[PDB]
Design a protein around this nucleic acid. Sequence first.
RNA 1: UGGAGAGUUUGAUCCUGGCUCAGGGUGAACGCUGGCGGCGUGCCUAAGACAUGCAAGUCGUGCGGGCCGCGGGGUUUUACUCCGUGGUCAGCGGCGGACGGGUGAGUAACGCGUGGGUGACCUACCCGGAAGAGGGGGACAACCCGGGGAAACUCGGGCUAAUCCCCCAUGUGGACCCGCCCCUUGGGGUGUGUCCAAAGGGCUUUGCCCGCUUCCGGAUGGGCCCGCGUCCCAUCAGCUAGUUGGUGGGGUAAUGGCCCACCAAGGCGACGACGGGUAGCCGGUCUGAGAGGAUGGCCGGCCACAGGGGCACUGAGACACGGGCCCCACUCCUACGGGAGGCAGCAGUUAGGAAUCUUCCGCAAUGGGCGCAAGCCUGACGGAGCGACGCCGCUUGGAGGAAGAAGCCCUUCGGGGUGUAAACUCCUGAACCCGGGACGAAACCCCCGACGAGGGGACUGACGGUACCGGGGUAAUAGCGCCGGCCAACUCCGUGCCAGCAGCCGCGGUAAUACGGAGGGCGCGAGCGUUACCCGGAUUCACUGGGCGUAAAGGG
Lengths: 99, 666, 208
Amino acid sequence: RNLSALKRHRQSLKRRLRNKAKKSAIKTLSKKAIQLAQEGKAEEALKIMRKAESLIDKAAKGSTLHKNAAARRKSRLMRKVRQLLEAAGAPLIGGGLSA
Amino acid sequence: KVEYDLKRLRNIGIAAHIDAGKTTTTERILYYTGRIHKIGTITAAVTTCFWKDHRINIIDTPGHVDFTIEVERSMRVLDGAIVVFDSSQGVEPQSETVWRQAEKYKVPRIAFANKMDKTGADLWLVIRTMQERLGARPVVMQLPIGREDTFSGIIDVLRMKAYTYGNDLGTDIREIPIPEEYLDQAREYHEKLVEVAADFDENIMLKYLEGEEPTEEELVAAIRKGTIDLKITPVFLGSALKNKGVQLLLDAVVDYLPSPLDIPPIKGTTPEGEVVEIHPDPNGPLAALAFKIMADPYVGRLTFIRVYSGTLTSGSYVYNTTKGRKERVARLLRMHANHREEVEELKAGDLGAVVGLKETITGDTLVGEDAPRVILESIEVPEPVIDVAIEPKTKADQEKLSQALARLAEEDPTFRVSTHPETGQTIISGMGELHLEIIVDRLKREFKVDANVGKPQVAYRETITKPVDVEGKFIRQTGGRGQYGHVKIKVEPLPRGSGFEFVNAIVGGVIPKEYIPAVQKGIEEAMQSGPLIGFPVVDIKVTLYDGSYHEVDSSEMAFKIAGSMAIKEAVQKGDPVILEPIMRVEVTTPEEYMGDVIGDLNARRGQILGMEPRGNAQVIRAFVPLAEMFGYATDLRSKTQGRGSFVMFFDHYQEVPKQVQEKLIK
Amino acid sequence: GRYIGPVCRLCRREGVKLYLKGERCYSPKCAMERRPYPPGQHGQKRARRPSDYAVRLREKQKLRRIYGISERQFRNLFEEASKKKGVTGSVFLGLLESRLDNVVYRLGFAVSRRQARQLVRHGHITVNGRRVDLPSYRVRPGDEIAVAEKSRNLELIRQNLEAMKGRKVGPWLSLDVEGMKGKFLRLPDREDLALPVNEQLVIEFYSR
RNA sequence: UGGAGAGUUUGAUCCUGGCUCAGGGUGAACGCUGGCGGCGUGCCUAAGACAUGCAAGUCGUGCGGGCCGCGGGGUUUUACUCCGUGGUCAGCGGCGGACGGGUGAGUAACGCGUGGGUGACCUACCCGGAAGAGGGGGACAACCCGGGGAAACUCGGGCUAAUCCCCCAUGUGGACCCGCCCCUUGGGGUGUGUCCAAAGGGCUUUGCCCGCUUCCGGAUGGGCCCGCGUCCCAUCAGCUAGUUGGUGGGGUAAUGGCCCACCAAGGCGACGACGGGUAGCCGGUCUGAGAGGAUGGCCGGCCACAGGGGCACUGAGACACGGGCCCCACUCCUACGGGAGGCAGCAGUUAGGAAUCUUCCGCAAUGGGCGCAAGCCUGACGGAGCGACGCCGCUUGGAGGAAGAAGCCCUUCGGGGUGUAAACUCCUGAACCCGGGACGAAACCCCCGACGAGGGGACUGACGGUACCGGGGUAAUAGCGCCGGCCAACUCCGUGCCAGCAGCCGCGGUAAUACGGAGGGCGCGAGCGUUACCCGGAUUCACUGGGCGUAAAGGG
Ligand SMILES: CC(=O)O[C@H]1C[C@@]2(C)[C@@H](C[C@@H](O)[C@H]3[C@@]4(C)CC[C@@H](O)[C@@H](C)[C@@H]4CC[C@@]32C)/C1=C(\CCC=C(C)C)C(=O)O
Ligand SMILES: Nc1nc2c(ncn2[C@@H]2O[C@H](COP(=O)(O)OP(=O)(O)O)[C@@H](O)[C@H]2O)c(=O)[nH]1
Ligand SMILES: [Mg+2]
Ligand SMILES: [Zn+2]
C-alpha cells in the first residue's frame, strides 16, 4: 500500500518552506533598497542595499540560490542603486558600492 | 498426513421437480457442514463441505423444468444424490420425472421430504407414491413428532433415538428421548427396517428370527450395501427452512451415500479403438473430464473438472485429446462455501477447478502430457423439442446475431442453430419454452440484437390434378440468328410422392437428337416457381411427343425455352393444387392423459394411426401438417402435466383443404 | 538425415554407376551392371532430349549423391566454396573431400561412405587424440585419423583394415595399416579425385 | 570476383508493350506430418482495461527515544530505574529513489545523423592542489497528555538530540558595482568599497579513518547554438502580431521575443512557404552485379511518453514510470463525511486478433544504490520452463543378400515394375541403465607487512548431481509438395463443360501425362506446402540504363 519515500516528501515540504522565505525576503528587501536609492536617501539606502546583499550570498550557501543566482541578483542590485544615486546624491556612507 | 482416504468422498447432487427445496436445502447443508465455531449463492458449480470426517461435493442445479440435460450431466460426473420431495405437494403429479431419469444413468440416491411443516405435509403420502408412481423400495428411516404445524422433534428407527427442535433458527435442538405416547409406533418400523436390511445381510436375518438385535454397525452395512445397488431408497425428513432433519440428513449422507470407490469405473477409448475402464487410482494415467466453464473476474477462465485416474497437479501441463491441445494448468482451486481455497492437486475421484487452459470447452477429456491420449465417453443425447423463427431485422442485426451464437453456442451446447435450407430465416433449437424464451432475453439484451420472433414457414409444393397437352412455340425469324424452337408435350399428374419423369417420345426425329438434352433442362428448370405461389412444382410425368425445328435458326437454347414454355403452361392449365408437408409423430403418454391427447391431435388437421402399448405408457402414431404443429411441446406437456413426450419425422406432401388454397394466395 | 532406403537405384537413374554400397557394387550386380537404366515403370524407354536445366540438376544430384549428404549441407558447402578465394570448382570438392565420414572411407576404415559414417558416429574414430563423432567434421592439413582403442579389435575394422594391405591411398593421404593411423597430407586435388562429375555444370546450376 | 531468363496479342512474322512465373528474405501466422540437442527468438493488433505477488533502498561510525533480550545496578532497600553492546520499531536527519527496466502514442522537428561553436553555461559522487574547521544561540518529530475520525490519518498543548536550522568571527580565497591594464562577444588581471565559509562521528584517541567549508584544476555526464542531410499531396499558393528587428526590464546555470513594456514595419514562399497524409531517427537489416529499392524486430546510441491534460515543490540533476497538486475518464473501500489508486517494470488475467511463453530458480557470477565494514536491496542480470519461430548438428541403421518371394501396378500376356528394397545373416549400438562428476570462484574479509607494493590464509554455485567421463546397452520416428508447358518427374482406372483445377497460357463437352484414385517417378526431408509482405527478375521511372513520324508520348 505504501513506500517510505514520503519521508522525502515531508522534507520536500520543509525545505521549500524554508528557502521559500529567504527567497521572498531578499525580494521585498531588494526593493526597499532601490526604492530609497532612487528616492534620494543616499546613505540610508546604501545601508539596506548592503543588507540585501548579505541575505543573498547568505541564501547562496544552502540550496536556495546558487552559482551566479546570487552574483546575478547582486550585479543588478548594486547596479540600479548606483544608477539612481547619480540622480544627484554622491554615495554617502561607505555602503557596499565601491568608490 | 494422508488427509485423503478416498473412501471419505461424497459427491452428491440435489435433484427434484421445481418448487421443491433443492436450492434452499443446499445453502442449509452449507451452514451445518461448516458452522465450525471452535476455539481458534451456489458460488460456482461444485462446492466442498466437511461433515464428520468426510468431504462433500455438491452440485445443486437440477430444476427439472422442461430442459433437464444439465441435471443429467452433473448426474454422470457425481456418484450420489438426494431426491428432495415436497412433503406438502401430496396429490403430487410431478414428484416424478427427476428419478426415472436417475437410474436412467445408474446412480444411487436417498429421499428427503422437505416441507414436513407446510399444510398437507403427510410423510406416508409420499411413500404411498414413491412406490405408486416410480415404484421403488424406499425405507422409512424416520418418523416425525408433530405432523405439520406441530413440528417438534424427530425419530430415527434404525437407532431408535429421538431428537427435538425447540425453534427454527437452527440452534436449540437436542436428542431428547421419545415423548410418552409415540414410542410404540416406532418398533414395527424399526423391525421392518431390520426386516428390510435382512434382504442384504443374512447375519441381520437369522439374528432377527433367533431374537438377537443386529449391531448398529452391521445394520447400517445392510441398508448401505442395499441402497448402492439401486434396490432401496432411505427416506428421511424435515423442514429445511426451519433447519430440521438436516443435520440428521447429513449423517444419512455418509452412512448410506456411495463413495467414489463404491461406484462403477468410467469407460474410455484408446487412440487405437477399444473400450477400457478408468481406475480411481491416484497413481495411474491422468484422466479427467471437464464440465463447466466460467469467467472469473479475479482469476479468469475456470474449468471445473471431475478426475477419475492419475492426479492433476498445480503448475504442470495437461493435454486435451478432444481438441488436441496442450493446456498448461497453473493453479488448482476448490470452492469452499465462502472463500477460495487454493490447493495443490486433485487426486482421482476428486472435484474442483483449474485455472489456465483456453481451448478446453465442456465435456473435454484431459490426460497427462504423455498419457495414452484417450477420450472418455460422456455421450449424452438430449436433442430439441421447440424452435422459433428468428429474423434479425435489417441485415444490420443479422450480424450481432452471428456473434450471438458464436459465444452463446459454447456457453451452452444444449441447442442448435440452423439456416432453413429453403428460405433464409434461421431456426433456434431449444429444449422447452422457457429455454428459447430466456435466450430471447440475453440474445436480445446482452447482445442488444432486436429481431423478429414468429414461427417457421412451410415447405409447400405445386402440382396438378388433370393431365394436359399444350403447344411450345418460340420462333423469331427476322433475319439471321432465326431462333426457332417448338415442342408439344404430354403432362400427367402422378401419385403424391412420384417425382420427376420425362418422355423422349419423338418418332423419326422431328426434333433433332442434339436438342433434347436442352429441351429437358428447360422443362426441368421452369418447374421451379409454381403457377400458384411459386414453389417446386413436383409429382408429375412429362411426355415430349412432338415439335419441329429449323435447319439454321434452331439452337440448343431456343429449345430449352420452348420446352420451358410448354411446361410453364400445362401446370397453369391442369388445375394446380397447393401440396403441403405431413409429419409422422409418436407421443409417448400414460393412457391416463391419452383420451384428450388424441383429441387435441384430431383438432389439428391430423388423422390418427394407432397405439401399441409400451412400458407402463402407451404410444400414439399419426400424421399432421407442420403449420398446425408448431410449439407442440408446450401443448403435449399440457395434456400430460409433464408425463408426455414425442418424436417427429417427415413422410409425404398432400393437398390443402381448398379453404386453405385461397388462404395461401399471399 | 543421411537418406536411407534403396541406393543401387540411384546407382541407376544417374545411369553412371556408384559405389554407395561399396563391396557388392563391385560384384556382378552394382545393380546397373544388370539393369543399366532409370528405375520406375517406364525407365527403359527412348529418353527425350534433356533440357538445359535437367542437365545441370543431374550433375549436381550426381556429385551430391556420391557423398550422400542433404541438399541443405551440400548447398552450404558450395555457397562457402564460392566466397572462398580460389577456383570455386576444385575448392568445392576440396571440402566435400575433407569430411570425416569421407576421409574415413578414403583411408579404408570402411567399405562404403554409408558405413564410414556410422563408424564416425559411434566414436570408433579419432582425430589427433580426442575422438570425434560428427561425420561433417572437417579435417585440416596434417591430422591423424585413427581408429579408437576400444574399437581396434572389432571384426569389421579388421576385414576392411585387411584388404588395405597392398592397396594405395590417394597421394593426399598416408596410411599405416598397423597402428590403424592415417595422415591428411594435403588437400586432395582436381584429378586425384577421378569423379564422373563435372563441377562446371553444378556451378552453373547454382547460378540460376 | 560480379550480371542466365521463360510463358502469353498473329494463320505466320518482326517490334512495342502489359500481365505472369522460377530466386532471396520474415518477430511471422495457417495446413498436413513432427524424434534429440545447442544457440537465438517469441502481443507486429487495443499507447484498451487490469485481480495477485514481487519489481528501491540503505547507513546505530549522524541524533534522541519506544519495545525486548543481557551486564552492573544506581541509594543504605524498590526509589529521581543511569550506564556500555546487540536485536528491534518507527521519528529524525544523510545519500539513493532523475541510474537501471518498459514503450513508440506523439513528433517532418536542430527530433535524429554528421561536423562544429560556446568571450553564452552546468556537473552529486571520483582524482590532484591550496587554506581552514573560532565562538555562541535555536527550534520539530519521536515521546507524554488532551481532542476529531468509520477509515486514511489529523488537530492542540508541553518536552528534547543531531552531520537540522540561525547569528558573530577569521577569511587562504571566491562573489558583486567603479576605475585602470592585457585580451577581444561576458577571457585573464588589478586597487577602493561591500558581501559569504563550515559538522561532527569511530578508534587502538596530540595519529589515523569517514566526513565537513571555501577556492583553483582534472575526469565523466549534460544544457543551449549553428552548416549540411532528413517522406507523399500543388486538385494545399500564398503564410505571419509576439509576427521580423530594436531599446530597456524580467527570467535562467546560460544565449535568446523565452516572457513584458514601448518604439520601427518587417519576417517567410515555386530553391515549394502555409496546409493536409504518413512516420519515432540512426548504427544497421533484407534484396541487388552494382547504382538503387525497400526497411528500422532482437542488440547498441539519441529522442519522447508513462491512464488523457495542466503545474510547480524538493534537489547537482526531474517538471520525476513504482513523488506531490488540480481537472477529466475509469477501479476500489465507505460508518457515503470523505479516502486509496495507475502493470508502455517481471509473471499473469481479460478484451482484441491469424498470432506471440512460467503468477519459475538464484543474487553463484557481472553490474548498480546505501555502509569504514560485516552486510542489506537489486523480476538489472545469470539461469531454468513452454513454442520446429529461426538457424546449426545428430538419429530412425551399416555390410552382405535372388537373372529377382509375396502383394500391388502395367502387359503385345512372352513379360515388365516396385527392387537389394523386404526376408534372412552376421555388427555397431540413439534411447536407457549402475558409477564418477565440473569450469564458471577469486576476490571483498583476515594475518604478516606500513590498512602501499608484494606474500600468505579462509568463506563463497541458481543452472546442477546438469554438461561431460568410464562401464553396461535394445535395430530403434517419416513425412510433405509435385509429375501439360514455364519445370526436373507418366502410365492405368474413374469421370463426361459434371465434379472439379487454376500463378499465367489454359485443362474438363467418352480413350484427360492438366479433374479424382492407384502404381510409378521427381524434389526436399523433421520437415514440406499455402497465405501475407519486401527486393529481384522489371534498362517496366532508365544516374549507371529508356523514349515521343505511324506503337503511349512535341505544347497551335
Ligand atoms: C443456477 C442454477 O443452478 O440453475 C440456474 C442457471 C441455469 C441452469 C438457469 C436455467 C437456464 O437459464 C440455464 C441455461 C442452460 C440457460 C441457457 C444459457 O443461458 C445457459 C448458459 C444457461 C446455463 C445455466 C442456466 C442459466 C437456472 C435456473 C433458472 C430458472 C428459471 C426460472 C424461470 C424458474 C434454475 O436453476 O431454476
Ligand atoms: N415453508 C417452507 N418452504 C420451503 C421449505 N423448503 C423449501 N421451501 C420453499 O420452496 C420454494 C423454492 O425453493 P427452491 O429450493 O429454490 O426450489 P427448487 O430450486 O425448485 O428446489 C421457496 O418458496 C422456499 O421457501 C420448507 O422446508 N418450508
Ligand atoms: Mg433452485
Ligand atoms: Zn551399386
